Design a binder for this molecule. Structure first.
Ligand SMILES: [Cl-]
Length: 187
């Protein structure tokens, strides 16, 4: 249940990167070597991962969650963004219920493009919620955003928030998170 530290987030990308993202050769080279200082540095190089980067204000910096809470928080969020589509037809009972019951008890009316239609590959909602999370902290340095993205495997025009909607997106994010895992909401 242990979180990551700013140091490990800034300098130890191999502590939290998903094998999905390793450069092919290193994936191929990966088979040995069970979190090692040279790979951390070599990963920061192969990807221009600026170690000069600010953590998005007010807890946007969820790049430090334990993986489990991270995947839960973003899954609940991606599900919620498909709430309406889902009323018209279960990754955690707690989360299934959250999406159906709280859809209209969170941010009032749903801004015009926030709710989306359904098609779904595996992990689809986690990626949706992650896309939404980054869009809510949009000034995020390529160093922050690129590192959060690395914690999951493999955005709609109406999510380029340019107004009060951005301030409403941050609020939805924080509320979904406050319920999706209270354990690690202190971040
Ligand atoms: Cl659950």
């Amino acid at each position: 249940s242990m979180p990551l530290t700013a140091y490990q987030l800034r300098f130890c990308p191999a502590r939290y990167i998903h094998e999905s993202h390793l450069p092919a050769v290193l994936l191929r080279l990966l088979p040995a070597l069970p979190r090692q200082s040279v790979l951390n540095a070599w990963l920061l190089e192969q990807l221009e991962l600026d170690c000069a980067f600010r953590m998005p204000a007010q807890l946007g910096g969820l790049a430090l969650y334990p993986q489990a809470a991270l995947e839960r928080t973003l899954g609940w969020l991606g599900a919620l963004l498909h709430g309406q589509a889902l009323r018209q037809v279960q990754i955690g009972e707690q989360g299934q219920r959250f999406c159906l019951e709280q859809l209209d008890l969170l941010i009032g009316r749903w801004p015009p493009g926030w709710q989306r239609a359904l098609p779904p590959e595996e992990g689809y909602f986690r990626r949706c919620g992650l896309a939404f999370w980054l869009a809510a902290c949009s000034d995020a340095d390529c160093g922050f955003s690129r590192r959060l993205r690395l914690r999951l495997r493999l955005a709609p025009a109406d999510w380029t928030f340019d107004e009060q909607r951005r301030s409403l997106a941050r609020t939805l994010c924080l509320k979904v998170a406050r319920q999706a895992s209270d354990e690690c909401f202190h971040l």
